[PDB]
């Protein structure tokens, strides 16, 4: 019989079936800020357009003319952010109304929604946050560290309280793709350059602690190999024991000498880290210990964008073919998998009780 798997795959959609041209399925033209929408910039005739796919009604996409170089949908609402060099505009689509506009000093080269109501803007020189509340304008958070100069910016994220900020770029150095991160502390107003490829923050409440710890998790393929780090940022909430830092290996098989991490999402429902590699591997790690639960190759196709999958507290992504795919914990299998296949009853029992999962009645 087929081995039980600790994760479940699910294909949601094939974008080519909605008549999206594969030429436009890629990092610069297709954005997925949340699991609620996908926006694709396309040129049909001489007219530039955006295609907005509502994931609750995906067979009826809307197409609208644009003149923007980038389009990103709010994570929760049909509110779109558009830009053209320095010119930023926010529209409420259903109201057909321009909510907000701003012209920056410098071109915005990367931007992303970091919350329901705040957009982060990256220029060649700095990072700003722009709240949609009231008449708020963009506020500069920090100046970019020289170690990200010349990098392609691929991600920006924050902790839940927006006190720890993380900018990630990549470049080619000595024939490998090297990740450069800038971690910034809002409270200290200090940056630290870190070599890393993909990361996420997470809230985690250690047994015995009254308050959640804020954890920084990142994966890197360095010169000396793959590593995953899980570390508390900042002084522990008063009362708390500190979270002991974890550093574990990230395996790459000998035939994947050029692979590296591209995406990370953390389930706080299951306290697991999902890591996806450039050339299509999925890894699952326990957030508490860093133990590797599972690795498999989804396929040969690069998954270039991901988001949290809210329904399953998993990860949803798009690959270059336009397959929209999710991975989540298989709640009925994960505990017996850990016990029987990994032969790790210790981890199995902990996860069973920690995350209220069945299966540890036996081992």
């Amino acid at each position: 019989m087929a081995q039980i798997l600790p994760i479940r795959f699910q294909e949601h959609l094939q974008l080519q079936n909605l008549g999206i041209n594969p030429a436009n399925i890629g990092f610069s033209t297709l954005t997925m800020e949340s699991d609620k929408f996908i926006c694709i910039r396309e040129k049909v005739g001489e007219q530039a357009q955006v295609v907005i796919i509502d994931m609750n009604d995906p067979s009826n996409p809307i197409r609208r003319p644009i003149s923007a170089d980038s389009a990103i949908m709010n994570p929760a609402s049909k509110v779109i952010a558009l830009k053209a060099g320095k010119t930023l505009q926010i529209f409420n689509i259903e109201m057909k109304s321009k909510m907000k506009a701003h012209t920056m000093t410098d071109d915005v080269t990367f931007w992303k929604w970091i919350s329901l109501n705040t957009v982060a803007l990256v220029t060649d020189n700095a990072v700003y946050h722009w709240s949609m509340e009231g008449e708020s304008q963009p506020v500069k958070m920090f100046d970019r560290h020289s170690s990200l100069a010349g990098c392609q910016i691929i991600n920006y994220r924050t902790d839940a309280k927006q006190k720890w900020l993380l900018l990630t770029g990549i470049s080619a150095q000595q024939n490998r793709v090297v990740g450069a991160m800038q971690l910034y502390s809002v409270d200290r107003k200090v940056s630290q350059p870190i070599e890393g490829h993909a990361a996420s923050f997470a809230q985690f409440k250690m047994e015995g602690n009254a308050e959640e710890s804020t954890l920084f998790c990142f994966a890197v393929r360095g010169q000396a190999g793959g590593k995953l780090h899980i570390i508390e940022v900042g002084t522990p909430p008063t009362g708390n024991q500190p979270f002991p830092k974890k550093a574990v290996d990230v395996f790459f098989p000998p035939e994947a000498q050029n692979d590296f991490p591209v995406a990370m999402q953390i389930s706080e429902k299951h306290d697991v880290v999902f890591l996806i590699t450039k050339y299509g591997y999925i890894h699952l790690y326990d957030l508490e210990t860093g133990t590797c639960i599972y690795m498999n190759r989804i396929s040969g196709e690069t998954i270039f964008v991901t988001a949290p999958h809210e329904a399953t507290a998993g990860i949803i992504g798009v690959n270059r073919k336009g397959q929209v795919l999710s991975v989540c914990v298989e709640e009925e299998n994960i505990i017996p998998y850990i016990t029987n296949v990994l032969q790790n009853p210790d981890l199995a029992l902990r996860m069973a009780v920690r995350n209220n999962l069945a299966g540890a009645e036996e081992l």
């Binding site: 502390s185 940056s191 630290q192 350059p193 870190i194 920084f216 780090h229 570390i231 830092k245 550093a247």
Partner: peptide
């Protein structure tokens, strides 16, 4: 720096 000690 020294935000975190890896």
């Amino acid at each position: 720096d020294q935000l975190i000690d890896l």
